[PDB]
Amino acid sequence: TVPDALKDRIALKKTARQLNIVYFLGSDTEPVPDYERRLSELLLYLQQFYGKEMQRHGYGARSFGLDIKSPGRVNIIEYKAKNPAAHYPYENGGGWKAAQELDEFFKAHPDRKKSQHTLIIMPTWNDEKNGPDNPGGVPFYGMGRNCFALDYPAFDIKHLGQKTREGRLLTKWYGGMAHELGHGLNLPHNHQTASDGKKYGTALMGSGNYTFGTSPTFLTPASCALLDACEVFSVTPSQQFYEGKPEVEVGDVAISFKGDQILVSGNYKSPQTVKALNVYIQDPPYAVNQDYDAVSFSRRLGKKSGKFSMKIDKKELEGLNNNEFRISLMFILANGLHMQKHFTFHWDALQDYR
Ligand SMILES: [Zn+2]
Ligand SMILES: [Zn+2]
C-alpha cells in the first residue's frame, strides 16, 4: 500500500490552492487499470521531489498542493469526454480542445477546481504506432498554466530506477511528466551551473526529463524562485495570483565585464513586491525551445523598490560555447507575473552596457 519509493518523504506545508489532476478519457477510451493508485503514487513522489528541492533552497517544505481524498490517494477528476480519443490528438490543437472542454466542465462544477493550474493525463493510444510498449498519441506539453502527460500500463513507480525496459520507459515518461508539469507551474527551460552540476546533477527544466529517477536531478535556484511565486505553492492565502499585468520599472541598468566576472546592477520599482531577480545567460538561437542551454542565476529581492547587485562567474556558464550570448533579466512579482529585459553581447567584442 506504500511503495518503497515513498518510505522517505517529508511532511509538507498546507497550501492555499491545489493543482487539479484530470484523468481525461475519450468517449471511446477505457481507463488504464489501477490508475488511481499508480498515478497517486507517482504524483505524491513528484510532490516530494518538488517539496524537497524547495526546502533545500530555503523555502521550507513547500510543494504544489494536491487534493487528497484518502491516505495515499489523490482526488483525481475522471472526465469522460464528449468525443472519441481521435478528436484530441497530440497535434493540431488537440490539447486546446481538451482544455476548452475542461473549462466548460469547471464552469459547471466550480467546486472541483482548486487552482488555476491543471495537469491533464490521457491514456496512451493503442494502435499500430503506439501502445503499452511505446506510449504516445496524446497531448504532451505545457500549455499556459495547464500541462498534458500520459498514462500506460507499466506507468508504475515500482520500476523507478530499475535497469529494465519498464524502468527506462518510466524515466522517459515520468521524467517527461515532471518536466511538463514544471512548465505548467510557470517554469521556463534552464541549465545547471557548473558547480551545481557537480553537486546535484541535472536540472529538471534542462535535460532532467532524461535523468529523472535514474541519475541525480534537481531544481535550480531560479526555478525555485519562480515556484516560490506560483499559485499552488502559496502558504499566503491573502495573495491572489496572475491578475492584471506585470508592472516593473527597471532603471540605471549596468552590465560590465571585469576579468572572468559579469557585473549586473540596477534599480526597480513596482506597485507589487518584487520577490526575486532571475538572470539567464544563453547562446543563440533564443526561441522557447532553443533555450535548454540558458544557465540561470537568482537573487532574492523582496521589496517593492530597491537596487539589485550580482556578480556572475563566467566559469559557471557550463555548456555555453557561442561567441554571441544573451543576458536576460527576469523580475518576478508576488502575484506570479514576471517581466524580462534582454541584452546581447559578443565575447570577442565585449562592450560594457550603460
Ligand atoms: Zn520543455
Ligand atoms: Zn539558446
Numbering used by the authors: 27 to 380
Question: Could you share sentences copied from the article?
Answer:
Here we focus on OgpA from A. muciniphila, a recently discovered O-glycopeptidase that exclusively hydrolyzes the peptide bond N-terminal to serine or threonine residues substituted with an O-glycan. A glutamate residue, E206, is well-positioned to act as a general base/acid during catalysis.
The crystal structure of full-length OgpA in its unliganded form was solved using zinc single-wavelength anomalous dispersion (Zn-SAD). The high quality of the electron density maps allowed the trace of residues 27–380 (OgpAWT1) and 25 to 382 (OgpAWT2). The overall protein scaffold and the conformation of the OgpAWT1 and OgpAWT2 were essentially preserved (root mean square deviation, r.m.s.d., of 0.37 Å for 350 residues). However, the connecting loop α4–α5 (loop 9; residues 227–246) is unstructured in OgpAWT2 whereas in OgpAWT1 displays a short α-helix. A close inspection of the two crystal structures revealed that the protein crystallized as a monomer. Both domains are separated by a long and open groove that runs parallel to the protein surface where the active site is located.
